[PDB]
RNA sequence: UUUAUUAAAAACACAGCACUCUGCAAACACGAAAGUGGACGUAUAGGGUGUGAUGCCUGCCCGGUGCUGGAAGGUUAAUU
RNA sequence: GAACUGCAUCUGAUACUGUUGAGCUAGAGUAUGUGAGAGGAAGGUAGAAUUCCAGGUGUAGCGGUGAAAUGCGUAGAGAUCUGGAGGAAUACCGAUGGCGAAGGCAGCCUUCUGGCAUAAUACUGACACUGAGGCUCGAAAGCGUGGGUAGCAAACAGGAUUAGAUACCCUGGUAGUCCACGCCGUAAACGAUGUCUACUAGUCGUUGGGUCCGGACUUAGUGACGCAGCUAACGCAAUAAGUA
């Protein structure tokens, strides 16, 4: 849940942290770990290709099994760990044969329960099933887009999808973005909603809390000069121009979707 | 809730005589078990306000009976709340 | 606690209803349950079209079981895809005599 | 005497041609049995033994 | 935090708020492309824009210019 | 002289109050069997209907009003048929009917759960009533955060009516209404009638019981009348506004 901080300091007056006393306080499973260094949002040309990235805490990469190809072999949840690489929690699995893996953790998933993968699996949070073996109306996550590729959609804290139905070899889904989508019925999904449902509910409280996460400050375009931003310029405060990115592209309703090969996989979107 | 099988067991332990079921000790013992049993119902239904008024009533009734014993037989009172943990 | 459950099976899937009933029968009898009545009403003309069909197969069977097994039963009915409707009752007594519908 | 939701033949004469429960001022049934009459019809309607209305 | 070397501030940033884009080969950015970052992330995420703790709040105008949706009609390129 | 109502200290009395010992069951409770109920909380589901989206038929209107107009419609509306999405409420039953301390509570089903009504036996033996402060609960509206959003609809926009019309009427329409968790603590929160006792003509309904022989009686509610009595009058009148 959330826990407000006492206003003992001005920097602590609006710190509202998410606290989970049920998650592992120890260190992650060593063998499922990878070194991972910050990039500062720079590509192989050394250029900033995504701004406001840089800094933060060193963190390992936990190798999450987004594929779940160990079918018909039961695994028990050894422990639920915190993951710095994502917002969701991760369950340490313990397969019958002793092999240990990390998966995204469902909200309704605790330590000790058994998780199954494959086609003949119970409909319980944690199990990974092809979209044809999942009855309509259940809440799922970790949605595959290609067969055998691994989970792509609904992988963030609190993510969930509504399996609306089937119209042949596709499965109609309703994503949290409000977009109705068809996906091949042979793709897999995991039952339940993703844990850490109270993540959006938090409040960092101070500028240094965002610096701890690798985020650098962001300078509004109207705070610039015209040589740096289309919004730059002016004696005093002024916008003067239609809102636009520093590269000259509208940011108040201009739709930017170029794909014409996936255009037939999308039923509709939602207007609100 | 308490069943008949266990309800008769509390009476049989706080008997003041032959099949009395009316003494202050057996009544307070029955209310105490009933009150503790409903603690599980109100942990899952805290918004239940109409049932909780009934729970307060037996809490109030148990207090009245304990006041009566304290005024009637002090030894019968200090011993009874020692067993019931009140 | 006695329970009276009536199932609505799809007419197309009425060929496995005998194997469907015994699956629940064995489930209840396994967990110290007693089947006080069981009858197959047969194909019946529905009063209104359910799921775009006009005829369906009715199965009634009064049972006695615990809460845990009833939860198993309710889950099976919902995920069966052949039971198009179900109605579970709590009966104070045990009913054995044949119902007037059969 | 007693009433159940499986007395569909008996429930027919307590329901009108368009499917509404007949009021007690017409049939004259007791208040106790009308309450049992109403819930039995309501359950029989759910099981599709009796129509909610005469057009569906 | 800032005008290294006349301006340290009411300027910038900031936690928070809103709009909008983006269904993943994501949008977006570097690049001539390959290859990258975004991100071994996945809409509780990522980008852009504005505003700037908090408290009370945030009225009217879609004529203009944008943006989004629609296609009855008018006009309309190469080509033929 | 009387009086100074008083105060003090002794003595006597024991009907009542106080304090105590023992006992009793008639007030109040307990155990056991049946019964009724929109009592409360959590989940699930069903059928109508509205709205929206997509198609088929079809063509010039639809909608609305006291009339109109705004609005929708030749980009194909309205009507009609077939699908899909979604939210909210639960027609009939339905009832001076029921349950709840009040506020309130209606499809159906399961789970958790409160009180009440009822015959008999057993039991405790005055454990009672009321209650300043206090605490709890407490319609609707409203507020906070997070979801949802079909219909209705404050505000708002337009059309009318009018001298004007910041209204009534019309076409739209956002907060709200819905959900979760918290605040708020107020209503003509009314029976304008505090709670608890006992007693006082009667008549006719009705709900849940019970006991007798279709009736009769007895209970606990809920009504319509109507004596005595009360009331300024209205009126109340065993559910008192009568007698205490």
Coordinates of N, CA and C in Angstrom, one line a residue, chain C residues 4 6 8 41 44 46-50 58 60 85-87 89 91 99-101, chain D residues 2 4-9 12 43-53 56:
Chain C
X4 N -29.8 -28.3 -4.4 CA -30.6 -28.7 -5.5 C -30.1 -27.9 -6.7
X6 N -29.9 -27.5 -11.0 CA -30.5 -27.8 -12.3 C -29.6 -27.2 -13.4
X8 N -28.5 -26.7 -17.6 CA -29.0 -26.4 -18.9 C -27.9 -26.7 -19.9
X41 N -34.5 -34.6 -17.4 CA -35.7 -34.1 -17.9 C -35.8 -34.3 -19.4
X44 N -36.2 -30.1 -23.8 CA -37.4 -29.3 -23.5 C -37.4 -28.0 -24.3
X46 N -37.6 -24.4 -24.8 CA -37.4 -23.3 -24.0 C -38.5 -22.2 -24.1
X47 N -38.8 -21.6 -23.0 CA -39.8 -20.5 -23.1 C -39.3 -19.3 -24.0
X48 N -38.0 -19.0 -23.9 CA -37.5 -18.0 -24.7 C -36.1 -18.4 -25.2
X49 N -35.7 -17.9 -26.4 CA -34.4 -18.4 -26.9 C -33.2 -17.9 -26.1
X50 N -32.5 -18.9 -25.6 CA -31.2 -18.7 -24.9 C -30.1 -18.9 -25.9
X58 N -32.3 -30.4 -20.1 CA -32.4 -30.1 -18.7 C -31.9 -31.3 -17.9
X60 N -31.6 -32.3 -13.7 CA -31.8 -31.9 -12.2 C -31.2 -33.1 -11.4
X85 N -26.8 -22.7 -18.7 CA -27.4 -22.1 -17.5 C -27.3 -23.1 -16.4
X86 N -27.3 -22.5 -15.2 CA -27.3 -23.4 -14.0 C -27.9 -22.6 -12.8
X87 N -28.6 -23.4 -12.0 CA -29.3 -22.8 -10.8 C -29.1 -23.7 -9.6
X89 N -29.6 -24.3 -5.5 CA -30.5 -23.9 -4.4 C -29.9 -24.6 -3.1
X91 N -31.5 -26.5 0.0 CA -32.7 -27.1 0.5 C -32.5 -27.6 1.9
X99 N -39.7 -35.8 -9.2 CA -40.4 -34.6 -9.4 C -41.5 -34.7 -10.4
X100 N -42.5 -33.8 -10.3 CA -43.7 -33.8 -11.1 C -43.4 -33.6 -12.6
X101 N -42.2 -33.0 -12.9 CA -41.9 -32.7 -14.3 C -41.5 -34.0 -15.0
Chain D
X2 N -48.5 -26.8 -0.5 CA -47.1 -26.5 -0.8 C -46.9 -26.1 -2.3
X4 N -43.8 -25.3 -5.4 CA -42.4 -25.4 -5.9 C -42.4 -24.7 -7.3
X5 N -41.2 -24.4 -7.8 CA -41.0 -23.8 -9.1 C -41.0 -24.9 -10.2
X6 N -41.1 -26.2 -9.9 CA -41.3 -27.2 -10.9 C -42.7 -27.5 -11.2
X7 N -43.7 -26.9 -10.5 CA -45.1 -27.0 -10.8 C -45.5 -26.1 -11.9
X8 N -44.8 -26.3 -13.1 CA -45.0 -25.4 -14.2 C -46.5 -25.4 -14.7
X9 N -47.1 -26.6 -14.7 CA -48.5 -26.7 -15.0 C -49.4 -25.9 -14.0
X12 N -49.0 -22.1 -14.5 CA -49.6 -21.5 -15.7 C -50.9 -20.8 -15.4
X43 N -38.2 -17.8 -10.4 CA -37.1 -18.8 -10.7 C -37.4 -19.6 -11.9
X44 N -38.7 -20.0 -12.1 CA -39.1 -20.7 -13.3 C -38.8 -19.9 -14.6
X45 N -39.0 -18.6 -14.5 CA -38.6 -17.7 -15.6 C -37.1 -17.7 -15.9
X46 N -36.3 -17.8 -14.8 CA -34.9 -17.8 -15.1 C -34.4 -19.1 -15.8
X47 N -35.0 -20.2 -15.4 CA -34.6 -21.5 -16.0 C -35.3 -21.7 -17.4
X48 N -36.0 -20.7 -17.9 CA -36.7 -20.8 -19.2 C -37.8 -21.8 -19.2
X49 N -38.4 -22.0 -18.0 CA -39.6 -22.9 -18.0 C -40.9 -22.1 -18.2
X50 N -40.8 -20.8 -17.9 CA -41.9 -19.8 -18.1 C -41.4 -18.6 -18.8
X51 N -42.2 -17.9 -19.7 CA -41.7 -16.7 -20.3 C -41.8 -15.5 -19.4
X52 N -40.8 -14.6 -19.5 CA -40.8 -13.3 -18.9 C -42.0 -12.5 -19.5
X53 N -42.1 -12.5 -20.8 CA -43.1 -11.8 -21.5 C -43.4 -12.7 -22.8
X56 N -40.3 -12.0 -27.3 CA -38.9 -12.1 -26.9 C -38.0 -11.8 -28.2

